Copies of this chain bind each other. A is one copy, B any other.
């Protein structure tokens, strides 16, 4: 059972040394008592023996073991933030002449890494609609090396049909590296590796940390891809500090109870918005009628609290200020996955500009909500007051 696993993952005596949680071992230098101990540590430098702090300490090994257990992987690489995990996990598997095929709903920094970093290093990127499914086979080139998924998509929340995408990729290019940014699911509401994806990447910054006060990325790989991920990310110096690794392990323990609340509250808000006369569309994976909802219901074991909706009109700048500047409980900030509720707005052309080779299908202003842990009726009252400011 997931709740029991979240409470126990990575907590073994060699890391906890008698406490409930792993010790915090802060280190660059790790000491070898003898030459033979140094040789053993060198051989096992990526296999959980203390060698050098860039490879990790007991605190990192504990987190890595937890992530491998929960996401069903062979190894877990750590990074300073989610964006670093995306950029470096892609970089680890490409070279001049390769091609990446990425969903057009990918998180904008992920897209910008491809267009602004990879292109000038000789790696091209092509794009696909998130509902392409089996038809992705027609986009696979002789040089396609990586297929990059993000489900639900950023901002607009479209859910892929992962089984159809994976089967089509494997029919054409069985050896391709299929990766997913699995942040919205916190890596646990969608068991990516069990679907035949090779690497599951998360911004642990979001729900794993859970409190908006730490930044970290993770990437959990299957056995086929682990050694390359591990060693290439290490060549770029990617690591996280021991204290944030500790706080990530700590966040796991309450992830189940948090996610259930985020699901219950956000689905109630989505259902209410869907009935509201000032709302044109709700984009929530769990809401019937949302893009790819059928795949969410089939393939996921729950929802988190992030979603968006489209208003029945395009707000003017004055209406945007009247709306956003006067909330009592929702606040404006980037990121998500914490205990508090957040709100942001984007005009349609802003979204179109981050949908490469595509246009958007709406004209109202888009509002992205994160539903936190506040009482849902208080949140509904805040949204209702917002609607009254723009009616």
**CB-contact partner of A235 in B6, B87, B320, under 8 A:** B87
Shortest CB distance A323–B (Å): 9
Contact across chains for B236 and A113 when beta carbons are under 8 A apart: yes
List the B side residues contacting A54 at CB < 8 Å: 81, 83, 215
Residues in A81-120 with C-beta less than 8 Å from chain B: 81-88, 91, 95-96, 109, 112-113, 116-117, 120
A214 CA to B24 CA in the complex, in Å? 12
List the B side residues contacting A238 at CB < 8 Å: 80, 84
A33 CA to B17 CA in the complex, in Å? 11
- Could you say which of A31, A82, A91 has the most chain B C-beta atoms within 10 Å of its C-beta? A31
Stretch at the interface among A158-166, A292-300, A370-378: A370-378
A299 CA to B101 CA in the complex, in Å? 51
Q: Does A391 contact B (CB under 8 A)?
A: no
Q: Does A308 contact B (CB under 8 A)?
A: no
Q: Does A273 contact B (CB under 8 A)?
A: no
A211 CA to B7 CA in the complex, in Å? 10
Contact across chains for A373 and B257 when beta carbons are under 8 A apart: yes
**CB-contact partner of A52 in B113, B334, B339, under 8 A:** B334
Shortest CB distance A236–B (Å): 5
Contact across chains for B237 and A28 when beta carbons are under 8 A apart: no
Q: Digitize A27-42: 1 where CB-to-B-CB distance is under 8 Å, 0 elsewhere.
A: 1111111111010000
Q: Does A43 contact B (CB under 8 A)?
A: no
Shortest CB distance A59–B (Å): 9
A52 CA to B333 CA in the complex, in Å? 8
List the B side residues contacting A88 at CB < 8 Å: 236-237
A3 CA to B243 CA in the complex, in Å? 28
Contact across chains for B241 and A21 when beta carbons are under 8 A apart: no
A23's nearest neighbour on chain B, judged by CB, is: B23
Instruction: Please state the number of chain copies in the assembly.
Output: 4
A129 CA to B78 CA in the complex, in Å? 36
Task: Place the interface of chain A in its size category.
Answer: 35 or more
List the B side residues contacting A346 at CB < 8 Å: none
Residues in A335-377 with C-beta less than 8 Å from chain B: 335-336, 338-340, 342, 372-375, 377
Contact across chains for A213 and B19 when beta carbons are under 8 A apart: yes
Q: Does A250 contact B (CB under 8 A)?
A: yes
Contact across chains for A28 and B80 when beta carbons are under 8 A apart: no
Q: Does A212 contact B (CB under 8 A)?
A: yes
Assuming the contacts A32-B332, A50-B18, A205-B28, asked whether A243 and B240 have C-beta atoms less than 8 A apart, the reply is: no
Contact across chains for A19 and B257 when beta carbons are under 8 A apart: no
List the B side residues contacting A21 at CB < 8 Å: 26-27, 211-213
Contact across chains for B213 and A26 when beta carbons are under 8 A apart: yes
A123's nearest neighbour on chain B, judged by CB, is: B121
**CB-contact partner of A375 in B1, B25, B33, under 8 A:** B1
Contact across chains for B25 and A374 when beta carbons are under 8 A apart: no
A243 CA to B213 CA in the complex, in Å? 11
Q: Does A302 contact B (CB under 8 A)?
A: no
User: What are 25 sample pairs from A and B whose C-beta atoms fall under 8 A apart?
Assistant: A1-B375, A1-B377, A1-B378, A7-B339, A17-B17, A20-B331, A21-B212, A26-B213, A28-B334, A29-B342, A32-B332, A33-B325, A35-B324, A53-B215, A54-B81, A80-B84, A81-B237, A86-B237, A95-B121, A116-B232, A117-B232, A211-B250, A213-B250, A215-B241, A254-B257
Given contacts A18-B31, A80-B80, 10 further A-B contacts (CB under 8 A): A7-B340, A17-B23, A18-B25, A18-B50, A21-B211, A23-B24, A24-B25, A34-B324, A84-B238, A117-B236
